[PDB]
Write a protein that binds this ligand. Sequence first.
Ligand SMILES: [K+]
Ligand SMILES: [Mg+2]
Ligand SMILES: [Mg+2]
Ligand SMILES: [Mg+2]
Ligand SMILES: [Mg+2]
Ligand SMILES: [Mg+2]
Ligand SMILES: [Mg+2]
Ligand SMILES: [Mg+2]
Ligand SMILES: [Mg+2]
Ligand SMILES: [Mg+2]
Ligand SMILES: [Mg+2]
Ligand SMILES: [Mg+2]
Ligand SMILES: [Mg+2]
Ligand SMILES: [Mg+2]
Ligand SMILES: [Mg+2]
Ligand SMILES: [Mg+2]
Ligand SMILES: [Mg+2]
Ligand SMILES: [Mg+2]
Ligand SMILES: [Mg+2]
Ligand SMILES: [Mg+2]
Ligand SMILES: [Mg+2]
Ligand SMILES: [Mg+2]
Ligand SMILES: [Mg+2]
Ligand SMILES: [Mg+2]
Ligand SMILES: [Mg+2]
Ligand SMILES: [Mg+2]
Ligand SMILES: [Mg+2]
Ligand SMILES: [Mg+2]
Ligand SMILES: [Mg+2]
Ligand SMILES: [Mg+2]
Ligand SMILES: [Mg+2]
Ligand SMILES: [Mg+2]
Ligand SMILES: [Mg+2]
Ligand SMILES: [Mg+2]
Ligand code: NA
Ligand code: NA
Ligand code: NA
Lengths: 50, 55, 112, 47, 73, 152
Amino acid sequence: GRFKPLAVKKKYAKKMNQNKPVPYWIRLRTGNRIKWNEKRRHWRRTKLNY
Amino acid sequence: SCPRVQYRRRMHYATRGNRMKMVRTPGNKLVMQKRAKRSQGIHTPWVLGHKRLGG
Amino acid sequence: VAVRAKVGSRSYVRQKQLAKGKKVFKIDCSIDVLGNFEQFFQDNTKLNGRKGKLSDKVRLSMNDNVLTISTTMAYRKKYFKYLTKKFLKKKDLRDWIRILATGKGTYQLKYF
Amino acid sequence: IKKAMRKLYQVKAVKVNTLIRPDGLKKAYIRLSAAHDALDTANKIGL
Amino acid sequence: PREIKTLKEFLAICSRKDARCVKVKHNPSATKFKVRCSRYLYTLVVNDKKKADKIERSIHPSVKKIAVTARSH
Amino acid sequence: VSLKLQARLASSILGCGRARVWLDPNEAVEIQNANSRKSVRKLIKDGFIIRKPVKVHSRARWRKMKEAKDMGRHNGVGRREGSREARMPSKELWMRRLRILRRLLRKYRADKKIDRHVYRDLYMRAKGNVFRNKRNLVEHIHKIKNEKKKER
RNA sequence: CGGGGAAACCCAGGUGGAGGCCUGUAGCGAUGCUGACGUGCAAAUCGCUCGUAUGAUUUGGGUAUCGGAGCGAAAGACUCA
RNA sequence: GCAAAGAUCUAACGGAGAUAUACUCAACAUGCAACGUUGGAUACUGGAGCGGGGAAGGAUUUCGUGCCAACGGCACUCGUACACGAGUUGUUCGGAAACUGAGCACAACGUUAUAUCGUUUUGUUAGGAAAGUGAAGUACUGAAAAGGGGCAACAGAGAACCUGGGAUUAUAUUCCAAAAAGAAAUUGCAUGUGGG
RNA sequence: CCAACUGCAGACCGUACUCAUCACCGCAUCAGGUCCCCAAGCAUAGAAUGCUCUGGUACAUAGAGAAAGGUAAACUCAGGGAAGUCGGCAAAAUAGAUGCGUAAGUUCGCAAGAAGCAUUGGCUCUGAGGGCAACACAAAUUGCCAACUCAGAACUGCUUACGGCGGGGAAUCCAACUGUAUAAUUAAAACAUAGGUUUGU
RNA sequence: GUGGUAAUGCGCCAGGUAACAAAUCAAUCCUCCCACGGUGAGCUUUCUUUUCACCAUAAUCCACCUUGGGCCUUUUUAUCGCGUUGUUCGGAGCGGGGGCUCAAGAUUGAAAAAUGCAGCCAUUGUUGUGAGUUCUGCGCAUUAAAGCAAAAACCUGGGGU
Ligand SMILES: [K+]
Ligand SMILES: [Mg+2]
Ligand SMILES: [Mg+2]
Ligand SMILES: [Mg+2]
Ligand SMILES: [Mg+2]
Ligand SMILES: [Mg+2]
Ligand SMILES: [Mg+2]
Ligand SMILES: [Mg+2]
Ligand SMILES: [Mg+2]
Ligand SMILES: [Mg+2]
Ligand SMILES: [Mg+2]
Ligand SMILES: [Mg+2]
Ligand SMILES: [Mg+2]
Ligand SMILES: [Mg+2]
Ligand SMILES: [Mg+2]
Ligand SMILES: [Mg+2]
Ligand SMILES: [Mg+2]
Ligand SMILES: [Mg+2]
Ligand SMILES: [Mg+2]
Ligand SMILES: [Mg+2]
Ligand SMILES: [Mg+2]
Ligand SMILES: [Mg+2]
Ligand SMILES: [Mg+2]
Ligand SMILES: [Mg+2]
Ligand SMILES: [Mg+2]
Ligand SMILES: [Mg+2]
Ligand SMILES: [Mg+2]
Ligand SMILES: [Mg+2]
Ligand SMILES: [Mg+2]
Ligand SMILES: [Mg+2]
Ligand SMILES: [Mg+2]
Ligand SMILES: [Mg+2]
Ligand SMILES: [Mg+2]
Ligand SMILES: [Mg+2]
Ligand code: NA
Ligand code: NA
Ligand code: NA
């Protein structure tokens, strides 16, 4: 609901900023192994519980 | 049919300090407005009778 | 409420009357069929719960495409709009002609 | 924020409203005193 | 909002250094002079047009006079 | 094409449910072009979107039945489901009767038809359930006055 | 408040609204069908029927007592399947 | 096996999702089934609501434009899915600043080989010297006032603001600009007008 | 020094959305679980139950369609009426309101809705029950007006016809009673209870 | 500081507010129904002076009739009077005549038509009665071997300054 402390809000904001796909040019680098993020999180699959 | 109202001041429990009244506005809407608490008023000492003072 | 009502008394319902007054209503039909209209009102304006037989209490006149009703009894202005719609229902004009109030005591015919 | 507006641009702010966004940054809505034109200030800023 | 009962009091208020403007409102049978001032809006009601004209004419030129109308919708 | 956005905005602007918003089925191209509340307001002004009236719920049958009931129909032995006390509370009946009797006695004492002694005598009897109605009490008062006249 | 009585008291009509009182919703439970289901909607649920429903009543948040210890209107019940 | 919660029908528009054919053959007997939107019809929820707002819990699921590989145990042109770009505005609303409750336990003291133990609101810490101030006379300086410091209620106490808006795609008792659409209340410090 | 007027200033954090037959817990968009506020019309005693305007919904895989055998918050059944079965299990059955009437037993409170008998529709009428306005005693009367309930009469009709709503009687055993209680096979005669008694101080 | 016989009106220490339960009966705001009237829409083969919708007024201020409590002064009451739906009050001052106060409404205005709504540069614009509702008032007598939190902050007085 409405209430949360600011520190909790900032932790949730960092997770929101992290939840993104790999930019395409990263796959073109010499000797690259990254294909997908593999740390993607969906709100309805795994809980953070902050 | 009829109108139904909501709380507007972020406290949704009907305690003695959160009494409401229903008022119709110039825009023809029905809204809740908070009713102030009231004091019992000035009294003589409790041991002497506890009566309300004139004037 | 003070006096219990009887079924048999439903044969005579009498309108209230104007104490020291006389009301006037006018319908502006300015916009061939000026007949079949005054007489339509004459034989279809209910008075004292009885159609037709308009005595001296209600009077009509059709002047310059305008129809006036002068009465000393209490009538709602809505009643003559109701009669006008009943009239326009028969001739099948309701899709073009409409009636709108234009002032106190005054109705007017208009186009859609 | 009001004092910084006065220093950085020669404008006077009559009202500052603030919020903290869900991504963590702070945003300010700043109203000028109607003796300055926000459009001209925006043009000078370059936006 | 406060009422003013007298022309003398209305003049004294209209001449204060904080009277921003006076809105003149015409009603079917009365005229209302409303002075914005600083904390309160002051209203003087006149029921006579012959006096209302002299009041509308006796205005200082430091204060602005505004005719109240229904503004563009 | 989908006019969901226009229907939602028109519901918000006109202040009704979606069942009362009417979108013209021949002006779909025009309605497709409105993306803001301002544009939808212009559509409403031009008449491609209108508000329908509510459905009818008529009270005519109830009014006719009420006329019959006031005349005295449909309330016999076979139509009663609640108990007599639930239909007409005896405490309410007693309160009405006693208030009537006390008001009558006050009027007579103020108008000087009876004195304080007769008032005080009848007040306690009215509390004691000696008089069944206003006419009963009035007849008792008249009997008192007649006997007093003869003896005096 | 009416009637009776030497007295002590007795008979009757109202008013009033008591109770771990009665019938019955919401709530809190769980009798019978030994009904459904029994690789379930569900690692205990569903339907009808049934107990109680102003009290030793039901319920939110806070707070206090645990592992040979705690808590228990006492079933070796319950202490995160 | 995908059977509780009664139920859909019709036309037009949209879409690759059709009216999709070798001879022969006018059409049936050789392209079925299924979908979104608008209008119309028919029903259901039935104010202890598949209505409108909040706490706990969740944390972008919210809004717009696209897209339809996987996922939404049938389906999809649709989605709480996927991509890109956006959105939460307060002197007065809730909290804190600033109350006390059931309670907690820092200091002090005691105990223990061991503090990671005990006491700590029945007016109240500690064998216990726990007060740092106004005022008088420019900071300074030094008389009174037993019982140390703090936490614990977003439903108890406390708490100065109301309507209108043609003002959003999405926020509003928070946004609106001098005719502030406007009308108020309240706190701090300074001017001057009257009175001490 | 004291209002009041006027000038200037009024800091911090929260604020999207959800709150559930899809946003929370139950491995899931699971017929389970989860605190608070607002609450319309008619029938009716009514927050029972049935239907409806406002707001909401047509989402839960569908189509064609007379097998047997199932499940049901689905029905009937001639004659008999518990013969069935461990056992009337299940089903049937009673039923609202008003008047009359009501046994043994009893801690005098009850038992009791004991048991039982009768009436009830529709239509047209009649009566009763009120308010405030105008030392001398039938203003003991004139006018105006509301809201519903109860009682009586004439005429007329039944195919006994929505929903909702106790079956009753005579006895034995146990426990005084209301309550609690083996979450997931035991709700009892078990536990508690008021009352009685004893012990330490 | 100052008026009125008075109830009471105007410019360190001691009390009070915060501060607390049931039922009954009245209840205001608000909701619903009805009567009368204005505006729009529906039905119309027939019938229907008809059926449906709408007719709005926020905080904050000015001035000053009704109900319910407490009290003052004058006339002094008694087996007797006053009063509630209800379990009661009076020489420790009942009732009547005049007043003083408090609580809750009302009625004037200001705000405020300049707003809102609905037909279409113009029209409209509402006043009465029932029923239900816990604010509030009935001041602080619900079972009771049950008797119904506290503090900050604030208010008034007694004293001296
Ligand atoms: K199969
Ligand atoms: Mg009784
Ligand atoms: Mg009971
Ligand atoms: Mg019961
Ligand atoms: Mg055992
Ligand atoms: Mg199937
Ligand atoms: Mg089904
Ligand atoms: Mg239905
Ligand atoms: Mg959380
Ligand atoms: Mg699928
Ligand atoms: Mg995503
Ligand atoms: Mg903020
Ligand atoms: Mg404590
Ligand atoms: Mg301490
Ligand atoms: Mg604290
Ligand atoms: Mg609070
Ligand atoms: Mg606040
Ligand atoms: Mg929103
Ligand atoms: Mg919000
Ligand atoms: Mg909810
Ligand atoms: Mg579920
Ligand atoms: Mg989950
Ligand atoms: Mg129900
Ligand atoms: Mg038989
Ligand atoms: Mg046998
Ligand atoms: Mg046998
Ligand atoms: Mg059985
Ligand atoms: Mg019987
Ligand atoms: Mg027992
Ligand atoms: Mg029992
Ligand atoms: Mg068990
Ligand atoms: Mg069992
Ligand atoms: Mg036992
Ligand atoms: Mg009460
Ligand atoms: Na079974
Ligand atoms: Na109901
Ligand atoms: Na048979």
